[PDB]
Design a protein around this ligand. Structure first.
Ligand SMILES: NC(=O)N[C@@H](CC(=O)O)C(=O)O
Ligand SMILES: O=C1C[C@@H](C(=O)O)NC(=O)N1
Ligand SMILES: [Zn+2]
Ligand SMILES: [Zn+2]
Ligand SMILES: [Zn+2]
Ligand SMILES: [Zn+2]
Lengths: 332, 343
């Protein structure tokens, strides 16, 4: 019965893969989201304007007719990356942002200084990866040893702290300035590590940064519920074939594009914070990125839908996040 | 190449399953170990003397010719278990010990315990008659973080239980934390513990960095490195109330590598050489025999074995998998080169 009408959302953190997997997964995004930040961690990564242009067109080829969907491309920051290439792609409207995955930050200072100069946002997967650092500590450690020093050196740089998973990060972002923002996935709001590990190990909940203890989940839910306007929707939908997930060494990533929007609606509703839902989905991100809000509207209805058990691929299947479960809100 | 001769070891914590799986896995234990504590968590559990006798015989049936192996049976403690039944199985040599799994108010009375308070008559009887209690020491309340569940058990269940029943002999099975190592180190002659090879060799990073590794997923869950190092320090100390219990806990590959992977490591094939590796790395091989072959017998009041086996420090590859009637088992350290194996 209950219906919620919102400005059409965008997805500020998305993995669309390539080839046949791209063809399968794009429609789950393009049907709902006006735009998405398309991450560059292909094999090999998207590190040139030419590669981004070709990749954008492959994405466009896979968008069903009638979906007004625009992929916002990103550059995978590397050592060899020429700041001129990055800026050129930015000036041509090819690169919307650049993504920093965990030789060093100091090594790419010139590139980062060009981003600061030209007003290009930096998207950060904020974990330090030293073998001596416990996997649950990697996010907190990044803040202290990389994020804060970076932000102090490059005070005009716009940074999105992607897919935050900790109270540490929530507090850091809450207390930051207008040049710092964050995305939060549906899984990090809905679950904590217990959901992944109690009663069985659930690789479909295994993703990076890893699900944390419940106090961290709670800090994230409180952050979105507060109306803080520098957190916004980023699914980190990160699809892997079923048997790459269900294996002796399961890949990290939740395929949550089919279920994310309704899952977010549930969280905000549970937090008595639906008054802040639209801004999270459809306004905060555009504002931070300096892009217009979408001028179309969609409706969610509070009617239970069962999530498919699997989605066919050319070979193997894809298991969606929440496969077989019931979702409380669906897109009308 | 170095040789380590030891008195034949025993495994003070083992899952042998039943049916065809039992037939497959028994030999990995019987070839090496003189005795093993056979856990009772079959479907349905072993909660009666009659079931334990029949299960014992099925295990004996599956022992290859010439292996000198004796299964030591246990009773699964449940709300509905008659203390007279437990006592009678103990008096008749059927039950060597009883096993307490985590309490849960929603458990069927025939399959487990709702609260420890609710099985006091049975625990009192065990105390009375000198039967040891083997504890899987975790609290499983939904609001407790899985990594805290062992430590929470110590405070909430173990310490009060031992304070209530002062004569009760307890094994803290498969300890995984510094909390438990400290608690056991500081306890009295009536408290002991077992430790698995995986909890000595690995921490949670090994299960989660670079990919999720269901063959390292077991309960109690692997903990932080500080906990691993505490365990290693405990065994290497020579402390004599910690002993070998593999918790070898086999599941079909398809049940491990699934959307909801079962907990347990099939470590029977590789455990003994893995313990030798750990003790050697800790410069404590002089304590290795006692851990494997002496400390458990002394705690249980049973004789030490008077035959010997030899480990040899010659590199070997572990099988990638072991065939079952249907599907396959993936052993602990599958495909790896190990340092020590049984001659
Ligand atoms: N989140 C994940 O667990 N995986 C992502 C990468 C990432 O966002 O770090 C992927 O591309 O597979
Ligand atoms: O408590 C347990 C049970 C065991 C099993 O599978 O029997 N496996 C485990 O990992 N630990
Ligand atoms: Zn990331
Ligand atoms: Zn990502
Ligand atoms: Zn156990
Ligand atoms: Zn066990």
């Amino acid at each position: 019965s209950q219906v919620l009408k919102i400005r059409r959302p965008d997805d500020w953190h998305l993995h669309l893969r390539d080839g046949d997997m791209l063809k399968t997964v794009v429609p789950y995004t393009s049907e709902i989201y006006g735009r998405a930040i398309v991450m560059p961690n292909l094999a090999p990564p998207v590190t040139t304007v030419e590669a981004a242009v070709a990749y954008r067109q492959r994405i466009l080829d896979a968008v069903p007719a009638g979906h007004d969907f625009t992929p916002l491309m990103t550059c995978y920051l590397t050592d060899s990356l020429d700041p001129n290439e990055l800026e050129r792609g930015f000036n041509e409207g090819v690169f919307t942002a650049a993504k920093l995955y965990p030789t060093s930050v100091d090594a790419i200072m010139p590139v980062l200084e060009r981003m600061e100069k030209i007003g290009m946002p930096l998207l950060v997967h904020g974990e330090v990866t030293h073998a001596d650092i416990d996997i649950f500590d990697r996010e907190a450690r990044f803040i202290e040893s990389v994020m804060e020093p970076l932000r102090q050196r490059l005070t005009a740089l716009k940074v999105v702290f992607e897919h935050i998973t900790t109270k540490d990060a929530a507090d850091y972002v809450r207390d930051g300035n207008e040049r710092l923002a964050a995305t939060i996935t549906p899984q990090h709001l809905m679950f904590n590590r217990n959901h992944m590990l109690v009663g069985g190990v659930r690789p479909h909940l295994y993703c990076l940064p890893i699900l944390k203890r419940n106090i961290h989940q709670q800090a994230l839910r409180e952050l979105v519920a507060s109306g803080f306007n520098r957190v916004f929707l980023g699914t980190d939908s990160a699809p892997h074939a079923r048997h790459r997930k269900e294996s002796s060494c399961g890949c990290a990533g939740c395929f949550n594009a089919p279920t994310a929007l309704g899952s977010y609606a549930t969280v905000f509703e549970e937090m008595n914070a639906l008054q802040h839902f639209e801004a999270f989905c459809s306004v905060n991100g555009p504002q931070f990125y300096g892009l217009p809000v979408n001028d179309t509207f969609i409706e969610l209805v509070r009617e239970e839908q069962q999530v498919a058990e699997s989605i066919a691929l050319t070979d193997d299947t894809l298991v969606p996040f929440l496969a077989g479960e019931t979702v409380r809100w669906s897109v009308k």
